[PDB]
Amino acid sequence: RHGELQYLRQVEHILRCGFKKEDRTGTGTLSVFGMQARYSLRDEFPLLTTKRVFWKGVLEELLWFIKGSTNAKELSSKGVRIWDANGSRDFLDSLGFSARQEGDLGPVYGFQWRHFGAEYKDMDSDYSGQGVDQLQKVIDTIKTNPDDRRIIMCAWNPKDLPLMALPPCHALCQFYVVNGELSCQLYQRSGDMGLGVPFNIASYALLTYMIAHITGLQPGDFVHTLGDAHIYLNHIEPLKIQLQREPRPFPKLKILRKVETIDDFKVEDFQIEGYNPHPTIKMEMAV
Amino acid sequence: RHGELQYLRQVEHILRCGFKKEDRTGTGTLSVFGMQARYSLRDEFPLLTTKRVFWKGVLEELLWFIKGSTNAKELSSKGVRIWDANGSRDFLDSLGFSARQEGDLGPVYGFQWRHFGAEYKDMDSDYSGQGVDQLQKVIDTIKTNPDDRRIIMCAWNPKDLPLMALPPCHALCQFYVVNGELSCQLYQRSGDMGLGVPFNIASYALLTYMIAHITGLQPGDFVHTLGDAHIYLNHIEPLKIQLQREPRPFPKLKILRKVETIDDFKVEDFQIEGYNPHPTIKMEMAV
C-alpha cells in the first residue's frame, strides 16, 4: 500500500472526528491527540505527491540544523524563508526579546542538537566544545552498538525554553537498527497537517538517509508520532481539495557522492528522482 | 472494544512479525520499532486483567517520583523493590559509581521532573528551588492555558545521562486538554512487553487521574507510544499463556478525598475497585 495514504487517512480522520480547539495564534483548529504512521524508506523517499513539497527548503533547513545554526538569516540567504517570520524584529519583540538581533531564533534545533546544556548567549557566539553533541553521539553509537535502545536526540530543553522564539515541535527522535536497516521515530508535539507535517516528514526521512549513508546501513522505516495533530480552520478547503487527488509513486533519493561525516554533506550531494507531484496548494501560516 | 485487546494485539504482533534482536542484557528479544495504543480513562482504569499487575508498586513508585526522590531505599521500605537492583552496591560499581551510597539512582525521574537542569550531587541533597519544576509547570499551564500544545514533562536529559543508573525508559510525556478532558501521551523509548509495559501503562494512567483531579478536569485518553517494543526470549511461553485469557472489564479508580496539590496525594487516597485479574504470571527481569 502507498505510504502517503497514511497521511491522507490522518487528515480525513481529523476532518471527521477531530474536535474544535482554540490555539495560541487565535486561528483555531480541528484537533486529534495521538497519531502514528510508518513511512518505508526502502528504495523510496516519502516526499508527498498529492501536493508539491518545497524540497529545497527541506534540504537547506536540515544542513542549517546540522551546522548548528540558530540564525534565520543564514537560512534566508539560501532562498529559504520558512523561519524568517519567527526571527523577525517585530515577532522577537513580541516575546520580550528586544535586545536580540534579528534572525536569532534562540536555543533551538541547531544549538540543542550540537550543544545541549551549554549556556546560550547569542546566535553567533562561539560554542565549540560546549554542551552535548547529540548528533555525533547518535552517529557514534549506531556504528559501535547498533542494538542500543537509547539512541536519542532531544531538542526539548526545559531549561532553555524561555529563550526560544518557538519551542521545538520535534521534541525528540530515536534511532533503531535491526537487520542492517536504520529506522527513525520522531515525536512531534504539535503538527500543522497542511503546512509543517509534509515538510517535517521529508526532513526526518532525509536525516535518516544521511545517517544511514554515514554508518554504512540501509534506510528502514521513519515512524511519525504526533501529539496535537491539527488542521487550521483556514486550511480545510485546500486540504479537502488535496484528498481528492490520487498519490503517485514516491520519488527516490540519490546521494551523489561518498560522504564520511555528517558535517561534510552539501546540497549538491542530493538528487530527488521521479518526483511528479500534483500542483502546489497555497496555505497561509498561522503566526 | 475492551482496551486491553490493544496490548494483546501488540504482543501478538511482536511474536508474529517482530525481528530477533540482541540486547544489552544478553538475553535477546523479538522486537518491533514504533507502536501506539490508546487507553480510555473515562469511567475505567487500564489495569491489565489477563495477569495481575503489581498495583501497590505502581502507586508507591509514582508518589516517590512526585516528591522528587532518587533513593531506591525510600521505595524499598514501602515493600516495592522494582528499583533495588539498579541501586545495588554491585550494579552501581558495574557503572563506576563507587563513591555513591547504595540506593542512589542518580538524577533520574524524580529529580528531572522537579529539578531539571540543577546540578545533581547525592540522593540526599537539598534541591528546593533549583532547576525547572516541570511537574508543577504542567499543572499550572493546564489550569491557565489548557489549549497549550507545549505541555511536556521531559526526563531525558542528555547532560545528566552519564550519572543515571538507568537512563529513563519514559523519555517524556505530553498533556492535552479538549472538551474538559485531560489526555496524556507517553513516549517510551524501550518497552519490556512482559514486565514493564503493563506497569508503565497503569503508572501514566494514574498520573493523568491525579492531575485531572487537581485541575478540575476529567480523565480522557492515555496514548502509549513505544520505540523499541520487545519481548524477551524467556517471556515467550509465559506471554503465549497470557494471550489465551480473555480480558475482564477494567476496574475503576476512586480518589477518596478532594486533594489540592500533587504533593498532598497519599497512598490511602486511592482505591482500585472491581479488580479480579487472571493469575499472576512469573517473568524474570533481564538485567
Ligand SMILES: CN(C[C@H]1CNc2[nH]c(N)nc(=O)c2N1)c1ccc(C(=O)N[C@@H](CCC(=O)O)C(=O)O)cc1
Ligand atoms: C517547518 N517550518 C517551520 C515552522 C514555523 N512556524 C509555523 N507556524 C505554523 N502555524 N505552522 C507551521 O507548520 C510552522 N512551521 C515550516 C514553515 C513554513 C513552511 C512553508 O511556508 N511552506 C510552504 C512553501 C513556502 C515556500 O515555498 O517558500 C508550502 O509548502 O505551502 C514550511 C515549513
Ligand SMILES: CN(C[C@H]1CNc2[nH]c(N)nc(=O)c2N1)c1ccc(C(=O)N[C@@H](CCC(=O)O)C(=O)O)cc1
Ligand atoms: C517499571 N519497572 C522498572 C524497570 C526496572 N528494570 C527493568 N528491566 C527489564 N528488563 N524490564 C523491565 O520491565 C524493567 N522495569 C518495573 C520493574 C520491576 C517489576 C517487577 O518485576 N516486580 C515484581 C515484584 C512485585 C510482586 O512480587 O508483587 C512483580 O511485578 O511481580 C515491575 C516494574
Ligand SMILES: O=c1nc(NO)ccn1[C@H]1C[C@H](O)[C@@H](COP(=O)(O)O)O1
Ligand atoms: O507542524 C509544525 N512543524 C514544525 N517544524 O519545525 C514547526 C511548527 N509546526 C506547527 C505546529 C503548530 O501549528 C505551530 C506551532 O505552534 P505551537 O504548537 O503553539 O508551538 O506550527
Ligand SMILES: O=c1nc(NO)ccn1[C@H]1C[C@H](O)[C@@H](COP(=O)(O)O)O1
Ligand atoms: O519497559 C520498561 N519500563 C521501565 N519503566 O521504568 C524501565 C525499563 N523497561 C525495560 C525496557 C528494557 O527491556 C529494559 C531497559 O533496558 P535498556 O532499554 O537497554 O535501557 O527494561
